[PDB]
Amino acid sequence: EMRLSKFFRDAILQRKK
């Protein structure tokens, strides 16, 4: 869908994992 939602997905969401 979006490559930015793919970027931050590993940036913001890997903090909370």
Swiss-Prot record:
Superkingdom: Bacteria
Where does the protein end up?
A: Secreted
Q: Which family does it belong to?
A: Belongs to the ComC family.
What is the recorded function of this protein according to its Swiss-Prot or TrEMBL entry?
Acts as a pheromone, induces cells to develop competence for genetic transformation.
The entry's protein name is Competence-stimulating peptide type 1
